Amino acid sequence: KPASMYRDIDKPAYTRREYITGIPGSKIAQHKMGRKQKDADDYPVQISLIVEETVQLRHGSLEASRLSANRHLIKELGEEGDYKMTLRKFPHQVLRENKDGMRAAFGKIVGTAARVQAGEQLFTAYCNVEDAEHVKEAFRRAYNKITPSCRIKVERGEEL
Amino acid sequence: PRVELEIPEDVDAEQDHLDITVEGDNGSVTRRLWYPDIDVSVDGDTVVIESDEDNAKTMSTIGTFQSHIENMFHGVTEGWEYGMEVFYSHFPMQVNVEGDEVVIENFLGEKAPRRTTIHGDTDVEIDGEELTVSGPDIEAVGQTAADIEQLTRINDKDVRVFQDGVYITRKP
Amino acid sequence: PQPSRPRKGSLGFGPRKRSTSETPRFNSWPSDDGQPGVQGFAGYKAGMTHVVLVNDEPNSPREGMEETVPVTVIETPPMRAVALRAYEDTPYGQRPLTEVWTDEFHSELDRTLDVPEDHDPDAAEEQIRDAHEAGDLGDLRLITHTVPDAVPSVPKKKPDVMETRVGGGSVSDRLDHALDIVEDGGEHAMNDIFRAGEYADVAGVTKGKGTQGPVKRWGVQKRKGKHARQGWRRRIGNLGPWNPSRVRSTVPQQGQTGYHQRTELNKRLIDIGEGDEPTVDGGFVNYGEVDGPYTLVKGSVPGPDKRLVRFRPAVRPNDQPRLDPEVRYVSNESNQG
Amino acid sequence: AEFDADVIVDARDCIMGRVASQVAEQALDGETVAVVNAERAVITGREEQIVEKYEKRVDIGNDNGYFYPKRPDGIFKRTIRGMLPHKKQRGREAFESVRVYLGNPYDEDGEVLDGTSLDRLSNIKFVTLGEISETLGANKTW
RNA sequence: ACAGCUGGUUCCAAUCGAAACAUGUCGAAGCAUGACCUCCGCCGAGGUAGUCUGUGAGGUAGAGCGACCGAUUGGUCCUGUCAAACUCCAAACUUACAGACGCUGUUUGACGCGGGGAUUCCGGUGCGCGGGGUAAGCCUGUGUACCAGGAGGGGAACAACCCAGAGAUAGGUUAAGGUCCCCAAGUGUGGAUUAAGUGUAAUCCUCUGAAGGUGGUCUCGAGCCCUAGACAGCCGGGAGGUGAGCUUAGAAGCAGCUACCCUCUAAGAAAAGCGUAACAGCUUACCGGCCGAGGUUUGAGGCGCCCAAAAUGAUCGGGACUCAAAUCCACCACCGAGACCUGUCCGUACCACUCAUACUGGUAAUCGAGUAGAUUGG
RNA sequence: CUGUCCCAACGUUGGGCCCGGUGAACUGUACAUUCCAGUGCGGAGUCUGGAGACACCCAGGGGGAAGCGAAGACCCUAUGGA
RNA sequence: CGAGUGGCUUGCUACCUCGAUGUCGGUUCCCUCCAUCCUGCCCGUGCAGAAGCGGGCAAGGGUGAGGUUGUUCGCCUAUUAAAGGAGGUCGUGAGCUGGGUUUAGACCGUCGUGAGACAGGUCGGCUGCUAUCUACUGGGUGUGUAGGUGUCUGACAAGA
RNA sequence: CGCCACACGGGGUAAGAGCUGAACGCAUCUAAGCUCGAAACCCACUUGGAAAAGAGACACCGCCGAGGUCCCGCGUACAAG
Numbered sequence A: 001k002p003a004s005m006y007r008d009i010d011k012p013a014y015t016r017r018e019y020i021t022g023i024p025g026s027k028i029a030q031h032k033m034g035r036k037q038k039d040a041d042d043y044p045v046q047i048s049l050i051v052e053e054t055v056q057l058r059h060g061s062l063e064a065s066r067l068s069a070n071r072h073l074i075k076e077l078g079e080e081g082d083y084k085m086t087l088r089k090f091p092h093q094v095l096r097e098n099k100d101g102m103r104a105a106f107g108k109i110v111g112t113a114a115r116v117q118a119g120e121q122l123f124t125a126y127c128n129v130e131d132a133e134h135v136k137e138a139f140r141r142a143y144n145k146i147t148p149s150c151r152i153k154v155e156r157g158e159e160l
Numbered sequence B: 001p002r003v004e005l006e007i008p009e010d011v012d013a014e015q016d017h018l019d020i021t022v023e024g025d026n027g028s029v030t031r032r033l034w035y036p037d038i039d040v041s042v043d044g045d046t047v048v049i050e051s052d053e054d055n056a057k058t059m060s061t062i063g064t065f066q067s068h069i070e071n072m073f074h075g076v077t078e079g080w081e082y083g084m085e086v087f088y089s090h091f092p093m094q095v096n097v098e099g100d101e102v103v104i105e106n107f108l109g110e111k112a113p114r115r116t117t118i119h120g121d122t123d124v125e126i127d128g129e130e131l132t133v134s135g136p137d138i139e140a141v142g143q144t145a146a147d148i149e150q151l152t153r154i155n156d157k158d159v160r161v162f163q164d165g166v167y168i169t170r171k172p
Numbered sequence C: 001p002q003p004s005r006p007r008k009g010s011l012g013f014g015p016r017k018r019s020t021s022e023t024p025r026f027n028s029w030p031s032d033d034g035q036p037g038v039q040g041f042a043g044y045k046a047g048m049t050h051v052v053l054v055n056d057e058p059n060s061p062r063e064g065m066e067e068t069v070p071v072t073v074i075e076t077p078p079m080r081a082v083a084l085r086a087y088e089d090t091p092y093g094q095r096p097l098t099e100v101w102t103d104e105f106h107s108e109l110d111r112t113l114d115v116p117e118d119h120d121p122d123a124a125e126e127q128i129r130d131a132h133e134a135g136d137l138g139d140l141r142l143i144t145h146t147v148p149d150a151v152p153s154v155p156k157k158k159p160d161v162m163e164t165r166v167g168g169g170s171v172s173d174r175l176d177h178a179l180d181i182v183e184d185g186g187e188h189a190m191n192d193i194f195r196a197g198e199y200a201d202v203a204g205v206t207k208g209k210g211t212q213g214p215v216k217r218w219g220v221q222k223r224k225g226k227h228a229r230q231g232w233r234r235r236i237g238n239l240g241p242w243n244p245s246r247v248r249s250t251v252p253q254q255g256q257t258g259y260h261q262r263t264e265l266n267k268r269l270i271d272i273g274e275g276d277e278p279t280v281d282g283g284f285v286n287y288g289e290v291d292g293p294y295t296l297v298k299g300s301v302p303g304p305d306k307r308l309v310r311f312r313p314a315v316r317p318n319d320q321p322r323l324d325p326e327v328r329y330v331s332n333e334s335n336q337g
Numbered sequence D: 001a002e003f004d005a006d007v008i009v010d011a012r013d014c015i016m017g018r019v020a021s022q023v024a025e026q027a028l029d030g031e032t033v034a035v036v037n038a039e040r041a042v043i044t045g046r047e048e049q050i051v052e053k054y055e056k057r058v059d060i061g062n063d064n065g066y067f068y069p070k071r072p073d074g075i076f077k078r079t080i081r082g083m084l085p086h087k088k089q090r091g092r093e094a095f096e097s098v099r100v101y102l103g104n105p106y107d108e109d110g111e112v113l114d115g116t117s118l119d120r121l122s123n124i125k126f127v128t129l130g131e132i133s134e135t136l137g138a139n140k141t142w
Numbered sequence E: 001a002c003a004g005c006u007g008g009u010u011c012c013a014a015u016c017g018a019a020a021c022a023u024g025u026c027g028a029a030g031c032a033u034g035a036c037c038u039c040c041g042c043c044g045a046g047g048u049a050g051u052c053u054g055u056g057a058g059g060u061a062g063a064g065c066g067a068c069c070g071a072u073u074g075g076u077c078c079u080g081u082c083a084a085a086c087u088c089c090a091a092a093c094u095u096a097c098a099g100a101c102g103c104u105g106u107u108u109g110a111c112g113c114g115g116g117g118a119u120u121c122c123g124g125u126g127c128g129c130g131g132g133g134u135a136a137g138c139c140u141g142u143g144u145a146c147c148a149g150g151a152g153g154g155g156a157a158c159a160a161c162c163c164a165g166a167g168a169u170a171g172g173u174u175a176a177g178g179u180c181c182c183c184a185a186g187u188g189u190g191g192a193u194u195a196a197g198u199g200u201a202a203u204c205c206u207c208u209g210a211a212g213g214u215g216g217u218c219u220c221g222a223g224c225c226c227u228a229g230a231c232a233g234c235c236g237g238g239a240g241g242u243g244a245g246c247u248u249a250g251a252a253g254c255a256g257c258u259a260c261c262c263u264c265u266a267a268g269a270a271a272a273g274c275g276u277a278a279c280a281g282c283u284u285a286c287c288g289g290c291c292g293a294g295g296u297u298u299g300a301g302g303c304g305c306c307c308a309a310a311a312u313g314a315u316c317g318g319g320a321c322u323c324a325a326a327u328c329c330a331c332c333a334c335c336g337a338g339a340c341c342u343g344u345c346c347g348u349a350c351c352a353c354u355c356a357u358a359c360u361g362g363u364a365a366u367c368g369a370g371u372a373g374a375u376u377g378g
Numbered sequence F: 001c002u003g004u005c006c007c008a009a010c011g012u013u014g015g016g017c018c019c020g021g022u023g024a025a026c027u028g029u030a031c032a033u034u035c036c037a038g039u040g041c042g043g044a045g046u047c048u049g050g051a052g053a054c055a056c057c058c059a060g061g062g063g064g065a066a067g068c069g070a071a072g073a074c075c076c077u078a079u080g081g082a
Numbered sequence G: 001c002g003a004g005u006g007g008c009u010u011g012c013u014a015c016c017u018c019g020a021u022g023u024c025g026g027u028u029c030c031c032u033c034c035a036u037c038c039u040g041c042c043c044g045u046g047c048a049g050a051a052g053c054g055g056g057c058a059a060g061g062g063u064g065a066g067g068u069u070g071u072u073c074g075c076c077u078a079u080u081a082a083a084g085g086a087g088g089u090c091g092u093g094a095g096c097u098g099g100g101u102u103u104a105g106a107c108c109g110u111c112g113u114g115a116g117a118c119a120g121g122u123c124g125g126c127u128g129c130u131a132u133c134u135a136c137u138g139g140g141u142g143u144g145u146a147g148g149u150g151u152c153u154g155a156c157a158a159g160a
Numbered sequence H: 001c002g003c004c005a006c007a008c009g010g011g012g013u014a015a016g017a018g019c020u021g022a023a024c025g026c027a028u029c030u031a032a033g034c035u036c037g038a039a040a041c042c043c044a045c046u047u048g049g050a051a052a053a054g055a056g057a058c059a060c061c062g063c064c065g066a067g068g069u070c071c072c073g074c075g076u077a078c079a080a081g
């Protein structure tokens, strides 16, 4: 199904699992990537991917963007490289689909999505100064797999 | 902006409207230099290219007019020389100048002669396996030299195997 | 998915209406090359016969062999170039300036024209020459007529007037060439303009077929099979779709067929002669006997017998001229039988 | 043939629409206007797109007809008509008292109207009406 | 014959003026009862559409959850997210009553009560908030204003978008909107941008244009380098120990492993990229020369460009427009309604006089549009 | 076996066309020379913008008048009928 | 995974028509679209050549004949440069056809106590009208430009 | 069902191949300029076309007479005209 059907925030907050049954599992494999034993303050450089428009991103788009971002970091910095990426948003919003005409139209559950407001951080990677241009490229691949336009903002780095 | 170009002693250049004529011992070249708010004039013995505007588009053309005039100065004195070499693998190619046009016969085994017309005062001299294109107007000479190489264009078959054709050897 | 098919008939000969002049009017003329000369002649259609010829074409495997070629016999007696019209280049195209006439007129030209009694050929000639000096002169054409009285099989004595161009050398030399033809008596023959073996363009007003339906007029199909027995035999399917809610002029409809001007291109002149060599036994059907100046045009020519056809050197020939073909035999067999 | 013009306008190096707008205003005020040198009249912009617009107008049509002039003679005349209510009595009289010409059929040199002239030294992106007509397929007779 | 169904039901004017909703109904194409419209009689001094303040009611927006609840990360306390059917919090706002101001009522009797007559119970659209649905000129709520039943002005046309609520006639000034022509009024002023005919399209089924890309161009900021000569280009040099060692038949900058050292010097790697079977060969780093003025890295903004394919004839209404007749920032003067101001008249209501509802005089900023329908004079 | 078809042609008889005589009907809110686009209850000769358009008459085949003909048999509805 | 364009499929909605806008398929005849099957000019190649594969510009012209089936669709054959797709009220019944859908007759299977039913199958089963307007194809009569004969011009228009 | 005829060539472009050339000393097919380049576009060719309201041009004849109509014999024409 296209994202056009689920990208906007038009329906109410439908997250209550005690009233919703048959919710598909999250396609998101990991949320903490890289070296999850080391701290965030141990790295000189902190670059985040900032979502420009208020959207609803599906778990499949979240997985595709994360997989195409971390796979570049596994390629350029190694499998056990000196970095750590974090996906801070979790898919809480349960999605429906009316799949009979318009009679008894309340749809059955087909998936999950994450509500991200404009200006928020979807991804945040902590790396060293030499690996700064590799992460800006991991986010360039990651923003092409989500719905809004994005900003690659450096929050801790006066090394330019 | 304003760029002043000192005219050589061998050269003397007149101007009317937007046209600039440059005369010398190797010949004469008349060109039209027309662009918004750029005035090209002859101040005694210097050529002045000036404009009241300093934007990238205006600046691009001032620099283009400079190189056009400097090239005309070189053309009417020392001239422009383009050297070429006629190479063939199996079929003996016959390059000959027939009138105001250079004709290439028996190219790649063709029964029909390939020909191109020479641009203006440009002279094409042949000495066996070598061809030398020359004249005062670089525009005319550069094109006539190019026309000769383009004349043996092959789009149908592999260029790496079928390498026959006159190629530019010397660029001025 | 319903098979594709080219549309019925051509749209280039439109509208298919009756011709204004029965005398054909050329819309194009040949290029100025060699010696100054009149760019066309005229005659009257006689009929058809065949001729045995020796193959002139160098590229043919049959070069030198006997070949039977169909031919249209046209009676071409001498014509009279009675005047010289001059055109001037105006910003609105070419406009007629003046005409230079004569004194010598054919006895029966007063059947069509209000023949000149008082004219000044010198003041007209002066006007044309001042225009040439000014560089305002366009082209030079001659007002020409035919002598149908010379043709016994054609009932009309009333001359057919038409304008013909003079092209060739410089505008100065052809002005003079034109004036020399006129100032004599205007008399010129087919020989003066054409040579046997050249490609000519024949213009003519076609055979009149009155009003005919779409099948004959545009070559549309007849109704096929079961559709042919219902009450519709030679009527098209529909006059158009629902939308656009109008009938387009492109749909094949009924109306006038024939009696239209056609300009048949690249017609080879087999032989130009005089006498009774191409005449058929018992005479040409619905025409008569030929005994005078004629032309033999390869193949068909527009219009019926007795109709005025026009000649012009081919504006767009495909082949190079192969002059004076060897005529081994001309048929004289009766067209009846 | 003679046309007693009150105002004779020189279209040479002048922006067509601006001249046309003024020639219309004058014709409705009862003036007998004559546009001269329309082959040399000008219209600013990218030649490639200007020609496309005019070529489309020539390709447009049906059985009812959409007669669009190819000559600069008629193009300027049609531009003036678009600024006049030619279907109304007052507007037709105004239009019929305006005539466009190729060159200058008069002795007098025409006047250049204010705000209509284009400085060729300041402009490169423009076209001459004659150039438009040559591209449209018209016979150059100027 | 009956029908809850379709069609039709004939003169003028004056006042007021809806409901398309609630409850019940073999009810949903219908009725009844309410809501609401109107008319009559009664009552006799208050009333409350607005605002402010006081005394109360409330858990929606937002927020937050080591505050409950239930979701929802990882690490050897820290670290990452959420909620229509969660809340330690918490608006705007809505709402009860009271006072005050305002407005209104006591000859125009308000508020209220009683009675007669209805119509109506297919609604629609805009905006705000919604719920369903991929969406819809969708379905179904709610508040509000409008269309219906609302003219006139503008918007190309166009129920509901903008101005505007309108007795007659007349003069004037404006509103929305507009001032190059069609077309009334500017080819107005100061300045900047755009070259795509972008654009000349408030709203919209109607006016598309996206993710992505852009040394197209304009503007603003930051760091670094530079006349001790920067950036680039061109010339010259790019050297020895030594072809490093190991590996290996060989490897000599450049298959691989390890080291990656010091002389000469103004530079020159235990070699950055090609190239060879391996050499050779070509440049890179690095230094010098010629030249001479800004250069380089990065950030932000403006307009435009690419992305961009549809059927009879292309379009901003059309013409057509380029230091604009586009766009943005300011500014100046105008055109332009039935609005507003103004003269006269008319109707209606009320006041004075009157038997009068006949005259006459007076008041209306706080009277003048109207479908169904109630009332009344002709 | 053949014109059913390729693929249509020519001919025959009666019409058709012109003249004398006889002489209806269907249909008609009005206006009406339209065409291309648009708009509008979303399928316009009539609204908007343009384009085109001198009037009248003859013959034609039927594109449009959501052509004329029948208060849709389909479908639903009616506290209808058989 | 993300962003779109189209309005050819299907679905949704119930705005328009129930005092009727004639069905599917086919046929005949006309116009168009491009997202191009061929033809022209091109770029790349895992481009030697030949034959190809992929891409670009491009709608001038072409894109055909047949076997089963009512079929649209599709399967199949032999040819071909190729035998592209789509819009025009799923163009086209005051043009045709009437094979299918969908009346009244009948049979079979299934379901039903039964009348009878079926988004099952099967045989049979009707095609109205003299054109007022408009539209176009062709043909005339007048008026305008303002006596006549003959010859022309060329704004525009059509073409494959 | 038979027979005859139905180009080439110019001009300007698209995709594309290039020249000269700057912004940016270099480089660069492009920004200004230029040489090329499609069965496509324009011309060429065929057909219509003085009702093109700017309603056209030329030559001769004529205004008491040029010419035309009716009539008559007929078709190269034709449903009336």
Ligand SMILES: COC(=O)[C@@]12OC[C@]34[C@H]([C@@H](O)[C@@H]1O)[C@@]1(C)CC(=O)C(O)=C(C)[C@@H]1C[C@H]3OC(=O)[C@H](OC(=O)/C=C(\C)C(C)C)[C@@H]24
Binding pocket: F072, G020, G021, G022
């Ligand atoms: C003369 O006939 C008509 O006009 C009809 O229009 C098209 C139509 C109809 C109707 O519109 C209309 O009544 C539909 C278009 C309406 C529709 O909703 C629908 O779904 C169909 C299947 C129609 C097709 C056609 O059907 C006819 O039966 C129906 O035809 C008939 O109903 C009847 C006819 C021809 C006669 C027996 C009266 C058509």
Ligand SMILES: [Cl-]
Binding pocket: C222, C223, C224, C227, C228, G028
């Ligand atoms: Cl048929």
Ligand SMILES: [Cl-]
Binding pocket: D060, D061, D062, D063, D064, D065, D066, D067
């Ligand atoms: Cl047209």
Ligand SMILES: [Cl-]
Binding pocket: D084, D085, D086, D087, D088, D091
């Ligand atoms: Cl008008």
Ligand SMILES: [Cl-]
Binding pocket: B036, D122, D123, D124, D125
């Ligand atoms: Cl410019």
Ligand SMILES: [Cl-]
Binding pocket: E165
């Ligand atoms: Cl009101």
Ligand SMILES: [Cl-]
Binding pocket: D053, E197
């Ligand atoms: Cl434009």
Ligand SMILES: [Cl-]
Binding pocket: E013, E378
């Ligand atoms: Cl009264």
Ligand SMILES: [K+]
Binding pocket: G017, G018, G020
């Ligand atoms: K219906």
Ligand SMILES: [Mg+2]
Binding pocket: none
């Ligand atoms: Mg090959």
Ligand SMILES: [Mg+2]
Binding pocket: C335, C336, C337
């Ligand atoms: Mg015979």
Ligand SMILES: [Mg+2]
Binding pocket: C337
């Ligand atoms: Mg015989």
Ligand SMILES: [Mg+2]
Binding pocket: none
């Ligand atoms: Mg009344």
Ligand SMILES: [Mg+2]
Binding pocket: E013, E014, E377
């Ligand atoms: Mg009254």
Ligand SMILES: [Mg+2]
Binding pocket: none
């Ligand atoms: Mg919330």
Ligand SMILES: [Mg+2]
Binding pocket: E148
């Ligand atoms: Mg109503």
